[PDB]
Design an enzyme around this catalytic site. Sequence first.
Site, PDB file in Angstrom:
ATOM      1  CB  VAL B 132      -0.939  -0.084   1.390  1.00  0.00           C
ATOM      2  CG1 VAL B 132      -1.731   1.299   1.431  1.00  0.00           C
ATOM      3  CG2 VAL B 132      -1.724  -1.495   1.394  1.00  0.00           C
ATOM      4  CB  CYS B 133       0.792   4.106   0.611  1.00  0.00           C
ATOM      5  SG  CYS B 133       1.046   5.806   0.688  1.00  0.00           S
ATOM      6  CB  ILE B 134       5.788   4.764   0.231  1.00  0.00           C
ATOM      7  CG1 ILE B 134       6.981   5.378  -0.808  1.00  0.00           C
ATOM      8  CG2 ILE B 134       6.248   4.150   1.327  1.00  0.00           C
ATOM      9  CD1 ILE B 134       6.970   6.098  -2.181  1.00  0.00           C
ATOM     10  CB  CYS B 183      -4.270  -0.329  -3.399  1.00  0.00           C
ATOM     11  SG  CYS B 183      -4.270  -0.371  -1.593  1.00  0.00           S
TER      12      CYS B 183
END
Lengths: 213, 210
Positions: B132-134, B183
């Site tokens: 997720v994210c970074i 995501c």
Amino acid sequence: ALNSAVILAGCGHMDGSEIREAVLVMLELDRHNVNFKCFAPNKNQKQVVDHKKKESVGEVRNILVESARIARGSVYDIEQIRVEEFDMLVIPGGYGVAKNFSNLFDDYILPEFKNAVREFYNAKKPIGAVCISPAVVVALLKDIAKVKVTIGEDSNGLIDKMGGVHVDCPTIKSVKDDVNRIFSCSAYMRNDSLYNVYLGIQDMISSMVNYLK
Amino acid sequence: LNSAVILAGCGHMDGSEIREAVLVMLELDRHNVNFKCFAPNKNQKQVVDHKKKESVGEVRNILVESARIARGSVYDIEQIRVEEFDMLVIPGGYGVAKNFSNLFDEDNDYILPEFKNAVREFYNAKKPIGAVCISPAVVVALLKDIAKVKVTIGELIDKMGGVHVDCPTIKSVKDDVNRIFSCSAYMRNDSLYNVYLGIQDMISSMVNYL
């Protein structure tokens, strides 16, 4: 156009706010298109706890600085709250709420917190409280109201002693005091699953929102 | 089904993104996937005051702070037994990149061996890795030498040795070949429920895949 204040007591169930309860409160407010703002007192936590060892430690943390973790930076000094800008208040639980805002588990209540919650109560604005927070709300209102809440099960008669009325309630549901506009759910008062905890918080926020509509 | 979850601290600027981690856990529970949380037993690179938004001169331990998100149930990542799990999810947070790697430092490329090795074990065993994210950028970097994987971070993946697929906050991406799932979440300043919608899709994909 709906707005909610959220009061936080730190970032962690043993010395602050219960992080899952706070996140789930913010998720469900947002699911209902209720914008929110987080507030906390600019004071040191009564304790800092290592949550792996589960022991207090000799280190000091500021409630507001730590609450900014949960708030992703958008946390405001509670002395700055303008209650007229909000429709409702939610108080997630966590041991820090009881330890940092009261002596009721060490009757005194941190003034800036009592005053804030009394301002919402006296303005007839719904107040939601999760986990141990309902007990603190009962106590801070007891001189002017006898309010009805759940903390799950209360075999010790805590709510009665604090000047309220307890309603037994499963983790997955919530309780509404439709006279005093106080809403509650038990969440991590029991050693239950995160999904069940969420079902109860979802019902509480729904009930608050339906009340304003 | 059992999932590992790896955590990097407690806070989006110096640890794991707290919302992402909680929402991942909620969806695992939703799908009746058991999970265990893991973190390395090492100090964070920085401690960031999340109110002023500046690093401060304090020292915090990654695993001790991760225990806040895990309500105590977090274990040293060196103890991970990959064969006991069907999948791995890595929530984001600037701590995932800053605490586990030099990849976003001003000044020779490096990933914390105990993290690099755990994720490689999952990949090498053909088990889904979700990020997720970074975190997808860190997953791409750590697999670079053995695979060129597809991830989304919403709208650097080229520089790190992967391939990017665009994705809305509310959806997720699957590298069907490499069994990587991703995501974008707080890579955009989007609403908390939208971030949730994409983590939900990601987890539902991983579970549906298995």
